From Swiss-Prot, chains A, B:
Name the UniProt record assigns to this protein: Protein B2
Protein's gene: B2
Family the entry assigns: Belongs to the nodaviridae B2 protein family.
Domain notes: The dsRNA-binding region is required for suppression of RNA silencing. The N-terminus is involved in homodimerization. The alpha2 helices of the dimer bind parallel to the stem of the dsRNA helix.
Residues represented out of the complete protein: 2 to 71 of 106
Location (main, coarse): host cell
Keyword RNA-binding: yes
GO biological process: symbiont-mediated suppression of host innate immune response
Length: 70, 70
RNA sequence: GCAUGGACGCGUCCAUGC
RNA sequence: GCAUGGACGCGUCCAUGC
């Protein structure tokens, strides 16, 4: 796994790590708990988008990409 | 995989997703790049902590645990 | 100068638990 | 009050692009 490979795969992996939890069903959950599980969803989503943004941000930096290329 | 388990295994799942990347070394890169990679490390470490804290917050709620299993 | 990304600081608000 | 998440405001630092 190349240094550039590690970074290019982070977003995918984070997705994999989170899917199970997010894809959970709580349709029958009480109100307060529902509010909590929605919040969890928001949290996981923000985490995921934030890591994605950072990766994208990184690959656009020519200087960084050169280093991850030799 | 019970619902309560999907929340309990989030941290371990994220560790698996991230450990590789936030474990790579780059002491040989120029300052600007080394600095950009530390930023990545900081980003990842924070998302990792955010998930753990949320998972903890959920698990400390009688309501959520009670519902997560009936 | 403008914009983007991240980290951080101070604060306002919302939810949930105690 | 404290904890955790989320939205938002102002500011700091780092990096890149224009």
């Amino acid at each position: 796994p190349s240094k550039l490979a590690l970074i290019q795969e982070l977003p995918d992996r984070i997705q994999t790590a989170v899917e199970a939890a997010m894809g959970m069903s709580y349709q029958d959950a009480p109100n307060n708990v529902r509010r909590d599980l929605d919040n969890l969803h928001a949290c996981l989503n923000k985490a995921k988008l934030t890591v994605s943004r950072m990766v994208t941000s990184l690959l656009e930096k020519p200087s960084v990409v050169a280093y991850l290329e030799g």
